[PDB]
A paper describes a structure:
Phosphoserine aminotransferase (PSAT) is a pyridoxal 5′-phosphate-dependent enzyme involved in the second step of the phosphorylated pathway of serine biosynthesis. PSAT catalyzes the transamination of 3-phosphohydroxypyruvate to 3-phosphoserine using L-glutamate as the amino donor. The pyridoxal-5′-phosphate (PLP)-dependent transamination reaction catalyzed by PSAT, which necessitates a lysine residue in the active site, has two reversible half-reactions. In yeast S. cerevisiae, the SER1 gene encodes PSAT and yeast cells supported by fermentable carbon sources, mainly by the glycolytic pathway, to synthesize serine and glycine.
Therefore, to elucidate the structural features of fungal PSAT, we determined the crystal structure of Saccharomyces cerevisiae PSAT (ScPSAT) at a resolution of 2.8 Å. ScPSAT exists as a dimer in the asymmetric unit and appears butterfly-shaped. Fifty-three N-terminal and seven internal residues (i.e., Lys 218, Asn 219, Ile 220, Ser 268, Ala 269, Tyr 270, and Asn 271) could not be modeled due to weak electron density. The ScPSAT monomer consisted of two domains: a large domain (residues 54–293) and a small domain (residues 294–395). Furthermore, the large domain exhibited a Rossmann fold that contained central seven-stranded β-sheets (β1–7 with strand topology 3-2-4-5-6-7-1) surrounded by twelve α-helices at the periphery of the domain. The small domain folded into antiparallel β-strands, β8 and β9, flanked by four α-helices, α12, α13, α14, and α15. Moreover, the halide-binding site and gate-keeping loop were located between the large and small domains. For instance, helix α9 existed only in ScPSAT, whereas human, plant, and bacterial structures exhibited an unstructured loop. The HsPSAT structure contains a cofactor PLP, whereas the ScPSAT structure is an apo-form. Due to the lack of PLP bound in ScPSAT, the N-terminal region might be not stabilized in the structure.
Residue numbers in the entry:
A (entry chain B): 51 to 267, 277 to 394
B (entry chain A): 54 to 217, 221 to 267, 272 to 395
The structure:
Amino acid sequence: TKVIEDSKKHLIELLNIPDTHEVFYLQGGGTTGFSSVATNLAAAYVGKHGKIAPAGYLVTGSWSQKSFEEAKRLHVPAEVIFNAKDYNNGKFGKIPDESLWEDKIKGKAFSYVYLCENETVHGVEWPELPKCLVNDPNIEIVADLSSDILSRKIDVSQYGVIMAGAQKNIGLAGLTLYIIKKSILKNISGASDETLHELGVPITPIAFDYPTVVKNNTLHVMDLVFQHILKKGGVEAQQAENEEKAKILYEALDANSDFYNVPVDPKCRSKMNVVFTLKKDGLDDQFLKEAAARHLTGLKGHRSVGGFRASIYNALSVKAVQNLVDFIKEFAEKN
Amino acid sequence: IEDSKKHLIELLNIPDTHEVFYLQGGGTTGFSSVATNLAAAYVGKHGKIAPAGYLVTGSWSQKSFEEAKRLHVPAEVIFNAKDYNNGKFGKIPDESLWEDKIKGKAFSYVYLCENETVHGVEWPELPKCLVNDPNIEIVADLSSDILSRKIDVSQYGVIMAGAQGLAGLTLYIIKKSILKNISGASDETLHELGVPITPIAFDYPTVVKNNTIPIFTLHVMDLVFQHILKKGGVEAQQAENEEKAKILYEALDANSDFYNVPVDPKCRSKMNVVFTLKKDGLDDQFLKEAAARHLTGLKGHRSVGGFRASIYNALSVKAVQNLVDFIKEFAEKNA
């Protein structure tokens, strides 16, 4: 019982979570993440100050977008600061430069700004925390590090709340991690009645009222994973290896630029999710089966955007990536 | 992928008008999602919002109402049984005194709780005023009775059963009508009407659209079914639990008044026998002398402060007979 306490200890270790933030887990792993973070962080604003302000969404891909549209559905005050789709013809793939939107943010008050660090379906990963949000002290950052939580050294002090579960519209199944500021929780409490109620701020169900979740306290499963990443260098190690894994993969595709298309702009190329397509779309299944033959599986793009997507994880070996690099390079010179 | 649904459908004769589905959470999760979902269902059929109405017979239906209020679902208590005996639960007012508050108002739904566990208050019957009113969708919580109380599923718009955090499972049998109508809301009419919106993870028409569901126990589910199916179904289980309770109450009722049974006979619960000692001094010896006969799990609820006798499906009549004997031995012993 309460191996929770140990896993939490592991997390505050590998991430160096400061005393200013608290770790809590939530049954949900997906959609549950959006709704609960929007309603709770709206209420945290109403606590700290006395009024409501809109929430800011940086839409860099599918998950970003869904997150915003759910804050819209719930009638949480929120606005799309930008939609990367609008800056390269309705398709994701770029992350507009700060200057083109940073002033939509500076000086204005926000309940929080949301972003999705790694956009799994489209292979858009933020190169950096936008510096315009970092320098503003009255903008709380909500980040979804769903893909990179244990593979990208981040500074937990800069974040209002960190979310990591999956990036799948699964049910209530799975778990979402949370690392939230204690400032925020105190302020979620310090607000009710007319304040939240005449302002129209939607009330979060108590099942998901963040302060009540920490007060109410099959999960050894992750405490195990936390332990293997520990010792083996921690997050910084796993980052450096995932980075290396991707460098090799991308070079193979860039090299045979005659044969493949990498549709995501290099600046925001995801290291966990590599997305590419064949210029001759009549050889996809030939590609899929030859790869099947080589025990290199899990490459068909999600059945929406199509094409191909090679996912990199902490458990993957550099030599297993190099096996795929070998096939990619061989298939292009073959055709 | 086990359709434990099929055995529930057989267990309760669930008609084709209704759909079984499950949700993770028990406890509060059911309060929250049923109120905003069913409020939306009203904006489906009609253009407007009507208040939800709550029949507060004990602590659980009280807490449902209080959460709907917190959430800003339009909702009102039709009665509160506490008012009809000195602010103490234990009674259900004659429907004469509230019939017309039902029949002459517009309600999204009317909520009642079949069995209030903490106070041992159970509805003798589904209220005839609710059933005759064609404009009232009944939302019933049979959380301690779903398998020991024969009911007519067609009389209900929502039957929900769990227990009384995010843990456990809440079971749902819902009119297909209601589902079509929560899908048939506009989302914009709901913003204007001020109706709070349920997070899509708990949006009933999507929860039924596909799923995932934390399982492994879902096997235990049809396990508990099927047995009951082959014991003679819910009717047999009901007759049995009735027997266990009738011999228990006879032991309390037939004393020279050594014990108090606070629940009115009209509305005494078959699953939770609440009782108390006329001379409170002896309540500590009561529990020791009971452990001396291997009878445990008998102390109040930390709030009410008397003694509870929670009858369930497993509890043998022999076991309640032993308890009957210890009640009858202790009252004579300590005359």
